[PDB]
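okkk here we go again. third time trying to get the NAJ bound version out, last two times i messed up the smiles copy paste (missing a bracket lol). double checked this time i swear
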Amino acid sequence: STAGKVIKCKAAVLWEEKKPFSIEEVEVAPPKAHEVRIKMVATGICRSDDQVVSGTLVTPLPVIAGHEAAGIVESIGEGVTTVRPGDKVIPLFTPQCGKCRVCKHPEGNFCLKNDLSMPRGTMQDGTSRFTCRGKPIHHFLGTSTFSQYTVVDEISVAKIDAASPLEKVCLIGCGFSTGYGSAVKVAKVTQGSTCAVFGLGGVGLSVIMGCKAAGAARIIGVDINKDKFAKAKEVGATECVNPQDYKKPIQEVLTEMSNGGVDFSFEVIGRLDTMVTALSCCQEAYGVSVIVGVPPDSQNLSMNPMLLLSGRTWKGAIFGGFKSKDSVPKLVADFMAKKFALDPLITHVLPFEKINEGFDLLRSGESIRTILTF
Amino acid sequence: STAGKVIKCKAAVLWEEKKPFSIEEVEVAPPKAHEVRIKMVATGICRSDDQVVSGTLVTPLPVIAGHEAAGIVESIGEGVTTVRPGDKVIPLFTPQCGKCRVCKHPEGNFCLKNDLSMPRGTMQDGTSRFTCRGKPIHHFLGTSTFSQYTVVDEISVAKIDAASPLEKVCLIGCGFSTGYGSAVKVAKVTQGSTCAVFGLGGVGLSVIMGCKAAGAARIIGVDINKDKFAKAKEVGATECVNPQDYKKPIQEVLTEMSNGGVDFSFEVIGRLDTMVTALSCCQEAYGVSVIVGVPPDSQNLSMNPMLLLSGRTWKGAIFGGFKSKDSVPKLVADFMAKKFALDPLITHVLPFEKINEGFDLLRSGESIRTILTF
Ligand SMILES: NC(=O)c1ccc[n+]([C@@H]2O[C@H](COP(=O)([O-])OP(=O)([O-])OC[C@H]3O[C@@H](n4cnc5c(N)[nH+]cnc54)[C@H](O)[C@@H]3O)[C@@H](O)[C@H]2O)c1
Ligand SMILES: NC(=O)c1ccc[n+]([C@@H]2O[C@H](COP(=O)([O-])OP(=O)([O-])OC[C@H]3O[C@@H](n4cnc5c(N)[nH+]cnc54)[C@H](O)[C@@H]3O)[C@@H](O)[C@H]2O)c1
Ligand SMILES: OCc1c(F)c(F)c(F)c(F)c1F
Ligand SMILES: OCc1c(F)c(F)c(F)c(F)c1F
Ligand SMILES: [Zn+2]
Ligand SMILES: [Zn+2]
Ligand SMILES: [Zn+2]
Ligand SMILES: [Zn+2]
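finally!!
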C-alpha cells in the first residue's frame, strides 16, 4: 500500500532554463481533499514543454514539466467523486471547474481556475506536492506528467475508458485534441473549403486531420522543413509549400494559389511573423485565421488593422476550444470507435529515462511525437 | 432633356488636404454603358469624409467626396436594368457586383470591385465623369455625393421605396447601416449580454441601437466627450464612462465593471490604441471585439497575441457586413415600417452650400449627423 504515504519516485526535474532535464528521486505527497494521485503510464513530448526549457514560455522553476499524458489513479483525497483508484485517466492542463462564468458559457473552455495566464506552479491551494533534495519543486499547468507519480486537482483530471491504450491516447491530453478542435470547433472548417496550415508538427498534423474530417477540398501545408511533407500528405494535405523555395512572401504565394485567399488559416508554430502571415493569407472579406502556436513571452506583434476592417476574423484557442473534462472521455471513446487515428502522430516510443534524447529528436526536426513510457 | 448631355452644376471640390471645400461649378458627363446619373437630394457628413480632408484616409486628390446620400435618377446609360429615371436611389460606397467570389459567399460583403482597398478615384472603367476649371476631378468610393449631380456604376446604386424621405434615409447609405449591422450581423450580439461601445458618434449610436435591438442587458458607452452621453443613453446605453475620469486604463475599468470582461466590444473611433483597448476589455475566453473605425493610413498597431490565444475573437467589417445592393432597399423598407429610428442621429440640417459649416460642427464635437439638402 502507498495510499496516505509519501511516495519516493523518479521524475525529470528542470532546475533552470536551457539545461537538460535531471532524472532523479522526488518525494510525492499524498493527495489532500479534492486531489488525485496518478501513476503515469505514458507521456508525450509537446513543443510547449520545450518552450519552458528555452525560456520562451515562462513558468516558475524548478519545475516538473509535462502536460500530455495518461495514467492510472493510485489514490484519491477526501471528497473526490469523479475518479477512483485503478481508473485510467488523462490529466487536463486546462481544468473544468464547472462553476465559473467560462465553464458555464456554451463556447468557453479557458476555465478561470487555469494556471496558464499567470502561472503560480502550484496546486489549487497554492502549495506543492513535490520535493527534491530537500527543495520544493513547482507543478506545471496543474499536471506535471514527467514523473512516475503526480498529484492533480480533481478539476484537472478526466476518467477515460478502462480498455484504452494509454501509450496512444495520451495525445488526447494535448496535441491531437488541440489541432483537431482548432479545425472542427474553433474555425468550424466548412465542406469544400481551402485551408492553409502553418507548421506540420504533431499539432499541425492534427489540424490537417480535422480539416479533412470537416470535408475541406484543399489543405495546403506550410513548413520550412520539407521532411514534414510526406506525413502531412498522408493525413490529408493536398499540397505542401516551403516558404524558403519562393522569392515572394508566402502570404502572396498562398493568396495566388487560392485564387484570392484561403477560407481558413492556422498558425501552428508559435512565431509572431507567421501569425501575421497566416492572417494575411486568408481571404480579406470572409477569411478566418486561428492562432494555435504559443508566442514568445512578453513580445508584441505588429499588424495593419485594415486586414480586419475588410472582414477577416482572427481568433485563438487553447486545447482546440474543448471543455476539457466533458470532452476528453468522448474523444477517447471516439478513438476506440475508430473515428480518428493517432498512430500517424507517433514517430518514436522511448523509455521515460531517455527524456533528453526525446527532446533532442524534437529539436532536430526528426520526430513528430515521441511517447515516453514509464 | 439633360439626357445624353453634359450637366453643369455646383459641387464641393477638395483641391488639397487640410483646406475648406470649394463650392463651385463642375461639368458632369453623361452616363456610359452600365452607369447611372443621379440628382442628389440629401447627403450626410460622416467622419470618414473628414478623414479624407485630414489626410488620414488616403484617396487621390483633387476629389468630390461624400458617400452617405440619397437622390433621384436623372438618366441611365446603355444596358442598365436595375433603376430607371425618376427612381429614388442610395449610392453604395461598397458595391455589389453579384458575380465575384465575395458577392457569391454567404457572409462576405466587401465586393472585389470596391475602390476602398487601393483607391483609384475613378469609375469602374478607370476614367472620371467630373471636370472643374477644365481639370479632371477624382471620384470617391465610386459615389461622390457632395455634388448636385453624380455618376455611379450600376453595381454602386440601389433602388429604394418611391415614398422614402430622402433627408432621413441617406443615413442608410453609411452610418446607420454600418453601426447597426456591426452589432446585429457581424458581432451577432446575444440577448442578455454585456456590450461596450467605444465612440458615441453617429456610427457608435447606431451600434448601440443594434445592441439594444439584439436584447443586450448592459450597453456601456465610452467616449472622452461627456456631451455625447445623454443621446447614447436615449438610444439604449445603460451607463457611460469617460476614460479621462480614471487613473487606470479603461480596459481595466471595463473588465471590473463587467465582472471579468464584456461579451462584445466595438471600436467606433478609428484609433490604433482604442482598437487594442477594445479587444482587451472583452472576456478573454469567449469575448468578441469588432473594429468599425477607420485607422490612420499605413499605420500598424502593436498587440500581444496571448489576448487571442485564450479564446477572444477579433474581427472588422465595412458597412455593417451588409451585402449592399440586397440590403439597402430592405433597410429602407424596415425604416418605413418603423423598425428603427433615424431622427436620434440627425442633430443639424443645413443647405449644401453651408458644407464647411457642417464640417466645423463635426470637428467641434457639437453634431452627430448634419444632413445637407441640395
Ligand atoms: N493552443 C494550444 O492549446 C497548444 C497546444 C499544443 C501546442 N501548442 C503550440 O503549438 C505549436 C506547435 O506545437 P508542436 O506541433 O508540438 O510543434 P512542432 O512539432 O515543433 O511543430 C512546429 C513546426 O513548425 C515548423 N516551423 C518552424 N518555424 C517555421 C517557420 N518559420 N515557418 C514555417 N514552419 C515553421 C517546424 O519545422 C515544425 O515542423 C507550439 O508553439 C506549441 O507550444 C499550443
Ligand atoms: N467600417 C465602416 O464601414 C465605417 C463606416 C462609417 C464610419 N466609419 C468610421 O467609424 C468612425 C466613427 O465615425 P463617426 O461615428 O462618423 O465619427 P464621430 O462622430 O467622430 O464619432 C467618434 C467619437 O469618438 C470619440 N472619441 C475620439 N477619440 C476618442 C478616444 N480616445 N476615446 C474615446 N472616444 C473617443 C469622439 O469624441 C466622437 O464622439 C470613424 O473612424 C469613421 O471613419 C467606418
Ligand atoms: O501545449 C499546450 C500549452 C499551451 F497551449 C499554452 F498556452 C501553454 F502556456 C502551455 F504551457 C502549454 F503547455
Ligand atoms: O465611412 C465609410 C468608409 C469606410 F468604412 C472606409 F473604410 C473608407 F475607406 C471610407 F473612405 C469610408 F468612407
Ligand atoms: Zn471553470
Ligand atoms: Zn501541449
Ligand atoms: Zn462582387
Ligand atoms: Zn461613412
